[PDB]
Amino acid sequence: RMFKIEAAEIVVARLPLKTHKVVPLLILHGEGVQGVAEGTMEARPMYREETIAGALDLLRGTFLPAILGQTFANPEAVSDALGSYRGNRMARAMVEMAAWDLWARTLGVPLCTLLGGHKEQVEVGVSLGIQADEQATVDLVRRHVEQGYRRIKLKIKPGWDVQPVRATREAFPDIRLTVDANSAYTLADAGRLRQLDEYDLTYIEQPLAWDDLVDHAELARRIRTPLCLDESVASASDARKALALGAGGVINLKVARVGGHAESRRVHDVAQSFGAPVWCGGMLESGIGRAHNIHLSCLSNFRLPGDTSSASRYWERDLIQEPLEAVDGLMPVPQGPGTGVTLDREFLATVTEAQEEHRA
Amino acid sequence: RMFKIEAAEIVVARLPLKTHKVVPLLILHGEGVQGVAEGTMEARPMYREETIAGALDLLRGTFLPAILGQTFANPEAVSDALGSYRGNRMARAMVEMAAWDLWARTLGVPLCTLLGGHKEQVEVGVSLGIQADEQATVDLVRRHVEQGYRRIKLKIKPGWDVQPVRATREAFPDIRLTVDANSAYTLADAGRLRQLDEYDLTYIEQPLAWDDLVDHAELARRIRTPLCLDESVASASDARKALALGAGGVINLKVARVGGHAESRRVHDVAQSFGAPVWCGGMLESGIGRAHNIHLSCLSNFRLPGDTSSASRYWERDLIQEPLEAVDGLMPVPQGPGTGVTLDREFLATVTEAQEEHRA
Amino acid sequence: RMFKIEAAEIVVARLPLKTHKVVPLLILHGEGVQGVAEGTMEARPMYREETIAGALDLLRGTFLPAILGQTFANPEAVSDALGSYRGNRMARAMVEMAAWDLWARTLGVPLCTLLGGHKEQVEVGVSLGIQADEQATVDLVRRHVEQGYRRIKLKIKPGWDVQPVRATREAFPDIRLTVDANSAYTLADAGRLRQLDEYDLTYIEQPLAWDDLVDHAELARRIRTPLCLDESVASASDARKALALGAGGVINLKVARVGGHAESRRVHDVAQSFGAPVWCGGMLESGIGRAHNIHLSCLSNFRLPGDTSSASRYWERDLIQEPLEAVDGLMPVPQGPGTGVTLDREFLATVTEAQEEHRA
Amino acid sequence: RMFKIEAAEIVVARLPLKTHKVVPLLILHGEGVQGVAEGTMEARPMYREETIAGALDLLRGTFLPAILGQTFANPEAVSDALGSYRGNRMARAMVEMAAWDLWARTLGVPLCTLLGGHKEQVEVGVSLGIQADEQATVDLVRRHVEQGYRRIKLKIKPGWDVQPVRATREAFPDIRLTVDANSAYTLADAGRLRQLDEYDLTYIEQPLAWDDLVDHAELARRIRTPLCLDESVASASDARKALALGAGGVINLKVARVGGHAESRRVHDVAQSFGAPVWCGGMLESGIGRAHNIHLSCLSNFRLPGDTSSASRYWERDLIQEPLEAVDGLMPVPQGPGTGVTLDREFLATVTEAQEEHRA
Structure with missing residues (x-):
């Protein structure tokens, strides 16, 4: 059945390249499981038009408030709930893809x-x-x-x-x-x-x-x-x-x-x-x-x-x-x-540069 | 996880209209649930090219032997297992739609x-x-x-x-x-x-x-x-x-x-x-x-x-x-x-023209 | 002048390849001669969409009843008599081409x-x-x-x-x-x-x-x-x-x-x-x-x-x-x-797997 | 079987309207029957480009010598025998349509x-x-x-x-x-x-x-x-x-x-x-x-x-x-x-301006 999104963490990692690449992560919590997605926008608009500052502000100020405490049938309903905001598809994707991971996990x-x-x-x-x-x-x-x-x-x-x-x-x-x-x-x-x-x-x-x-x-x-x-x-x-x-x-x-x-x-x-x-x-x-x-x-x-x-x-x-x-x-x-994969939380903590939690 | 299709029934009903209408049904059994679909081909090729005789021969002689006893991840994998054959989309839909119903019911x-x-x-x-x-x-x-x-x-x-x-x-x-x-x-x-x-x-x-x-x-x-x-x-x-x-x-x-x-x-x-x-x-x-x-x-x-x-x-x-x-x-x-609906088997039996069951 | 189709035989042969190929034959009888055609549909829809089961049912249940006992000017009139059924062109062809053979033979x-x-x-x-x-x-x-x-x-x-x-x-x-x-x-x-x-x-x-x-x-x-x-x-x-x-x-x-x-x-x-x-x-x-x-x-x-x-x-x-x-x-x-050719009836009998006759 | 064209007549009639209309006819003889066609070209090129003088010269000097004494399977074979020449479709049609009439009459x-x-x-x-x-x-x-x-x-x-x-x-x-x-x-x-x-x-x-x-x-x-x-x-x-x-x-x-x-x-x-x-x-x-x-x-x-x-x-x-x-x-x-119609030769003779007969 349906899933309630109880909490969301935004965690920003700085991962050294084998200098560094910034990995913005969204973790969505609900029904005793979690969904995790990764932002692909950059600090500066070099590959395309979005930026980390823009996207994260959009998440915390708009997309997260729209979904927290809410119950959904599927990831499609989550996307629908974000509203008619223009562009910012990679910001949207962080929410949508985390919702897919979460939904899949409620079903196993x-x-x-x-x-x-x-x-x-x-x-x-x-x-x-x-x-x-x-x-x-x-x-x-x-x-x-x-x-x-x-x-x-x-x-x-x-x-x-x-x-x-x-x-x-x-x-x-x-x-x-x-x-x-x-x-x-x-x-x-x-x-x-x-x-x-x-x-x-x-x-x-x-x-x-x-x-x-x-x-x-x-x-x-x-x-x-x-x-x-x-x-x-x-x-x-x-x-x-x-x-x-x-x-x-x-x-x-x-x-x-x-x-x-x-x-x-x-x-x-x-x-x-x-x-x-x-x-x-x-x-x-x-x-x-x-x-x-x-x-x-x-x-x-x-x-x-x-x-x-x-x-x-x-x-x-x-x-x-x-x-x-x-x-x-x-x-x-x-x-x-x-996704069939699992955050290494201890290692992630060592490379985290920002972290925040959001609830209803 | 995956579902095994253990058995299939083809039930042909002659359902009284408010004269009669021939209703071909396929029931797929597996994992303790069943999926049901309804054929939309007629006895003669009037709306389109398929017929009940062609479709049912294709099911019992080709499609059902291809899937019975097999284990599938999703309905798309079921369809794939029939991919070699040309046209006959309504016959195909009988299997594919029954598969959707079965799959959905394995997940609740x-x-x-x-x-x-x-x-x-x-x-x-x-x-x-x-x-x-x-x-x-x-x-x-x-x-x-x-x-x-x-x-x-x-x-x-x-x-x-x-x-x-x-x-x-x-x-x-x-x-x-x-x-x-x-x-x-x-x-x-x-x-x-x-x-x-x-x-x-x-x-x-x-x-x-x-x-x-x-x-x-x-x-x-x-x-x-x-x-x-x-x-x-x-x-x-x-x-x-x-x-x-x-x-x-x-x-x-x-x-x-x-x-x-x-x-x-x-x-x-x-x-x-x-x-x-x-x-x-x-x-x-x-x-x-x-x-x-x-x-x-x-x-x-x-x-x-x-x-x-x-x-x-x-x-x-x-x-x-x-x-x-x-x-x-x-x-x-x-x-x-x-589909959220349930066959009335006793009533169905009263209007059943022909039925058959297949296993691997 | 015109020709009356008095009888039709459907004869299905299994011909060993120099394993086997199925040859569905239609023989139409009228005016003391016969017309013979061969179906090119397969038991399974591999080259195109028709099948032998579909086509033969269409012949016996629809096309043959439409023409038996009827009198026609030409093969075009035979085709016209089959009606507005959709697709199934190879099934239609069995009747149409047998009618051509028959018509030609009434004229010599x-x-x-x-x-x-x-x-x-x-x-x-x-x-x-x-x-x-x-x-x-x-x-x-x-x-x-x-x-x-x-x-x-x-x-x-x-x-x-x-x-x-x-x-x-x-x-x-x-x-x-x-x-x-x-x-x-x-x-x-x-x-x-x-x-x-x-x-x-x-x-x-x-x-x-x-x-x-x-x-x-x-x-x-x-x-x-x-x-x-x-x-x-x-x-x-x-x-x-x-x-x-x-x-x-x-x-x-x-x-x-x-x-x-x-x-x-x-x-x-x-x-x-x-x-x-x-x-x-x-x-x-x-x-x-x-x-x-x-x-x-x-x-x-x-x-x-x-x-x-x-x-x-x-x-x-x-x-x-x-x-x-x-x-x-x-x-x-x-x-x-x-067609200028003649069934070898004795040999055909040895490889016949199905045969049926239909009259008005 | 095939037909031999033994002889041809060109009859030009001047038929009184309900002033007069010039009607050019070609009659083809063979196998004990005759085929008749009517030319639609006029004396002057008004509806299209062909004329009676051009067409009739083309028949008696070119088309008729090509077919007289020859044996043909069907009217298409007759037309083929004239295929080298350009345009003059109405002159051609006189031969081709007469051939259709003759052929049909050989078959009854x-x-x-x-x-x-x-x-x-x-x-x-x-x-x-x-x-x-x-x-x-x-x-x-x-x-x-x-x-x-x-x-x-x-x-x-x-x-x-x-x-x-x-x-x-x-x-x-x-x-x-x-x-x-x-x-x-x-x-x-x-x-x-x-x-x-x-x-x-x-x-x-x-x-x-x-x-x-x-x-x-x-x-x-x-x-x-x-x-x-x-x-x-x-x-x-x-x-x-x-x-x-x-x-x-x-x-x-x-x-x-x-x-x-x-x-x-x-x-x-x-x-x-x-x-x-x-x-x-x-x-x-x-x-x-x-x-x-x-x-x-x-x-x-x-x-x-x-x-x-x-x-x-x-x-x-x-x-x-x-x-x-x-x-x-x-x-x-x-x-x-x-064509199911029959020249009235005595009446025709009363309105005949010119006639001629050709053999091989």
């Missing part, structure tokens, strides 16, 4: 199962930076290919795009290879980007403006490599407009970017209805965010490998007790109810 | 809750057949408006379309009025159908061929009244195609026609991503199908009234213990786990 | 002649499976090329498509070569499929969903190889919409898939009106179905070789008395009235 | 039966010339409505179009009303022609240039009244092009204009695949041409009334023994093999 059921997924493991790839040169690139890719990662994603810019790709492609003609064009291009770069077509990349990710669809649709007409959208799809309706416009053929689905799991399933199903795959993006998450990602990636239209690589790549120590490690490019689903 | 959770709904009541419309004249049409509309229905549907046909709509709108300037054109028209009829535009109908349902989207798209360019698709939307990709082509702006969503609740929710979500409403169609269901319809209708993009009106309107006595009776145009969600 | 005229054809032989090719590897492929193709088959059709999938084709094409740069992409692809595969363009395949057959036209039209814009449609054209109007959309440039015309000979001529003439050829598909038919195919293939827009290869390739013994063998990729038209 | 089967028709009567419309004023127009329409015609066609011209249509529709709110715009308009006339829209005409026939589709397509975008094509549809591919371009939604089908019955049935079937009706146009034919028209009009997509009204309206005395007289808007199919 794995999160993926309630979302409609039935995989026991998900395929994963890796994303690498710009290397010094053609050889360095080929060597560092080789390192990850020898780990069995199922897709290699290279950062590119002008004019370091064709070189890395041509090099990597000759060394490895059979690997699945893609680029993150990092919005470093404008329509004026179409001809250069077209030079990548010979190398059979699965896609070129977000080459133009982070908020654009119209120019991407134009660029897609000029080159043969499929475009993948990331930043410009923050909702199921964005996904619809992008795919109808022909702005891309692939979507990088980031769960919090679109406002949480239910909206993510809708994005996933819209892409599928257009015959376009999705794959799971990464935001350098702690094991909380990483576990939410893995559960969502169990859905059938996650047909390309996600950026969901081994936790030990990122952290000398994670915030959860369970390891999240891929082998041979396959990441298993963490077992247990909800 | 209402079906609407697991599909993402949080409504306690759903809005209902009424459907009027062709009457003798204008005033007989108006008198019948007057009755149903007074009973509180939230939408009026008029059957129309060539030679009888503008007249009943004109007479109705003149008597009722502000009601929600729709028509069912029952694939009775051609493109030559565009000028006649345009004559409906001044009467501000919410939609005209499937005026052209039952399996067409392309000609509907053309008709929608020639008249201003919205088109609503029925038979030609049998999947989420069909929904995407119809909306993207501009074949209509509204979908009559029938859960069994599209293959069950999971795909129905995908259709619902695709439509929503286009900003287009769905509503719940009816197939003269016994209490089993009617209760599945009510649970599905709880989803948020069911924003026009559905054909889930009172069971007493159809049946002397229904196959379930619970009355499903709308009051003032509102149908309550039957309370309880899964 | 070859079926092809009444359909408007005037060829004495038809060009044929072959369709092969996936081979172990590039060499096996090339060798097995060589076997058929040395028999003079006029087109070689390879099964493909990802990622075994470019390899077979490149191999076969180098060994044989001049042969007519095509692939059956077997609906094993989605729009996400456009780039790979494009790699086939260099090898000058005549067409790629039904790469996307069996029931789709819209995505095929999109894929056609992205690759240079023509698309051929099979499953998604079940009528002359489907053919029109497909060709107007640009969903393909070639149609695989299967006579029973579209509902029989008259509809097939209409499909053939619509394709011709758009400047698109057709060719005759195959459904592993006995000599009954094979002979109907050959007669239909005499029409002038059958401009590409059909899958109508030698009977002795399939059966150690056929159900008819006459051989149907191609030499040098040319299949002669069986002489005589109607 | 009515022509309509072999073309696929099963109607015993066809619906007929009437064509009114330009009258002096509104009331003279209305009085004449009143007469023809009372005689039972199923469609009224008004000739219109610039300066006289809206007025007669307005007056007619006011007097007759519900009749099927059409106009013949006789290529008398230009695109500058779009606003005037749009003024016809409120009068719900079934179609406006060929308002712009006789050989155009493109400008008609443009006009159809500017007004809501359907356009009907006549002179610019001379083949099935012209039909496909017109319908796909949206040049019109209806085709006036004249059997001789398109090259005969086989191509006419292809035009009919193409139109049908687009969901567009055809109707049978008239060319003031003697009983020979009128009877071919009636047999063709039996096909199912002749869903609007045809100009095959009573022969007595045109001729003091017709060239055939049988009266073709419509009653209450219905023309019976003349009974008998082929």
Whole structure:
């Protein structure tokens, strides 16, 4: 039956990178279990428009007051209760995704199962930076290919795009290879980007403006490599407009970017209805965010490998007790109810920089 | 955790109307509970292409042997186990919808809750057949408006379309009025159908061929009244195609026609991503199908009234213990786990034409 | 003059493959001659949506009662008498095509002649499976090329498509070569499929969903190889919409898939009106179905070789008395009235698993 | 079996109207029967481009030597034997339609039966010339409505179009009303022609240039009244092009204009695949041409009334023994093999201007 949200903690961790990454956590308490989610907004608006200060104020001043002491049938009812505030989808996601974890746990059921997924493991790839040169690139890719990662994603810019790709492609003609064009291009770069077509990349990710669809649709007409959208799809309706416009053929689905799991399933199903795959993006998450990602990636239209690589790549120590490690490019689903992962409270305390509790 | 399907019954009933209607039921047994669904295919292929003989042969010879004795995480995993076969969506829906009911009952959770709904009541419309004249049409509309229905549907046909709509709108300037054109028209009829535009109908349902989207798209360019698709939307990709082509702006969503609740929710979500409403169609269901319809209708993009009106309107006595009776145009969600309704087995046995049981 | 259908037999044969293939036969009796047709639906819905159980029930319960004891001018009048039932085109075809055979026989005229054809032989090719590897492929193709088959059709999938084709094409740069992409692809595969363009395949057959036209039209814009449609054209109007959309440039015309000979001529003439050829598909038919195919293939827009290869390739013994063998990729038209072939009744009796007779 | 064409007569008659009309006839002899067809080209190129001198030279110098002494399976094989020559469709139709008549008579089967028709009567419309004023127009329409015609066609011209249509529709709110715009308009006339829209005409026939589709397509975008094509549809591919371009939604089908019955049935079937009706146009034919028209009009997509009204309206005395007289808007199919009508040779001889006979 229904669940009452009795309390909420906001806990902000500073996790040293194997300097540091800020991990905002929401813990929701109810019915003798807890749901935990991780914010993917940054202290500064560099990847997208939200910030930690903005989001946390929104949580404590608006979203939490709306739900505390209230009883709900499902996470959809929680989302409905937040109201018609505009944007701020990652802030919303913290509440929505914590509610999914909590709801799943009241039932004793794995999160993926309630979302409609039935995989026991998900395929994963890796994303690498710009290397010094053609050889360095080929060597560092080789390192990850020898780990069995199922897709290699290279950062590119002008004019370091064709070189890395041509090099990597000759060394490895059979690997699945893609680029993150990092919005470093404008329509004026179409001809250069077209030079990548010979190398059979699965896609070129977000080459133009982070908020654009119209120019991407134009660029897609000029080159043969499929475009993948990331930043410009923050909702199921964005996904619809992008795919109808022909702005891309692939979507990088980031769960919090679109406002949480239910909206993510809708994005996933819209892409599928257009015959376009999705794959799971990464935001350098702690094991909380990483576990939410893995559960969502169990859905059938996650047909390309996600950026969901081994936790030990990122952290000398994670915030959860369970390891999240891929082998041979396959990441298993963490077992247990909800996310199947558990905060390591003692370790978390050592890296906490802010903490607060809220009740009705 | 997971559920094992131990056994299945197919019960074919011949249920007396308020002549008789053949009602095929599938009961799935496992984990100490049962899931029940109702087939919407007829003896002859009149509404669509499937028949009772084809469907039941497909169940007992193919679908049931594929699932009996098997253990599943969720209804999506059940459907997956049948994925190789083409078409036959209503046969498929019998298994898939029974699986939803069973699964929900293993958790003790209402079906609407697991599909993402949080409504306690759903809005209902009424459907009027062709009457003798204008005033007989108006008198019948007057009755149903007074009973509180939230939408009026008029059957129309060539030679009888503008007249009943004109007479109705003149008597009722502000009601929600729709028509069912029952694939009775051609493109030559565009000028006649345009004559409906001044009467501000919410939609005209499937005026052209039952399996067409392309000609509907053309008709929608020639008249201003919205088109609503029925038979030609049998999947989420069909929904995407119809909306993207501009074949209509509204979908009559029938859960069994599209293959069950999971795909129905995908259709619902695709439509929503286009900003287009769905509503719940009816197939003269016994209490089993009617209760599945009510649970599905709880989803948020069911924003026009559905054909889930009172069971007493159809049946002397229904196959379930619970009355499903709308009051003032509102149908309550039957309370309880899964569909929240319960077969009356003794009454059922009195109207059973044929029954059979299958195990692994 | 007119013909009265006095009786109908349904005879179901189990024919061992050179395990077994089920051959449903309809025999219609009238005016001292008989017409015979073969159902191409399967026991399970694997190629398309109909099944033997569904179709036979439709024949005995609906189509046969409609025609028995009735007198008709032509096969068109027989089809008209079946009524407005939806879909089930292969069930309809059994009646329609048997009526063509019967009608032709009352006149003493070859079926092809009444359909408007005037060829004495038809060009044929072959369709092969996936081979172990590039060499096996090339060798097995060589076997058929040395028999003079006029087109070689390879099964493909990802990622075994470019390899077979490149191999076969180098060994044989001049042969007519095509692939059956077997609906094993989605729009996400456009780039790979494009790699086939260099090898000058005549067409790629039904790469996307069996029931789709819209995505095929999109894929056609992205690759240079023509698309051929099979499953998604079940009528002359489907053919029109497909060709107007640009969903393909070639149609695989299967006579029973579209509902029989008259509809097939209409499909053939619509394709011709758009400047698109057709060719005759195959459904592993006995000599009954094979002979109907050959007669239909005499029409002038059958401009590409059909899958109508030698009977002795399939059966150690056929159900008819006459051989149907191609030499040098040319299949002669069986002489005589109607189909020009004759059931071997004694042999048929040995492989009959069901038989029934129906009268007015 | 096959037919040998042994001999041909060309008879040119000058038939007195109820002044005179020149009627060119071709008679084909073989297998103890004869086939007769009537030329629809005039002495001067006024309706279309062909003339009696051109056509008859083409017959006696080219077409007849190609077929005399040759043996054919069907009329399609006869047409094929002339395939090298360009245009001249009405000359071609003389041979092709005579071949249909001959062939049908070798089998003892009515022509309509072999073309696929099963109607015993066809619906007929009437064509009114330009009258002096509104009331003279209305009085004449009143007469023809009372005689039972199923469609009224008004000739219109610039300066006289809206007025007669307005007056007619006011007097007759519900009749099927059409106009013949006789290529008398230009695109500058779009606003005037749009003024016809409120009068719900079934179609406006060929308002712009006789050989155009493109400008008609443009006009159809500017007004809501359907356009009907006549002179610019001379083949099935012209039909496909017109319908796909949206040049019109209806085709006036004249059997001789398109090259005969086989191509006419292809035009009919193409139109049908687009969901567009055809109707049978008239060319003031003697009983020979009128009877071919009636047999063709039996096909199912002749869903609007045809100009095959009573022969007595045109001729003091017709060239055939049988009266073709419509009653209450219905023309019976003349009974008998082929066209079911028979030349009155003694009467014919009295009005014969010139005759000739050819053998191999």
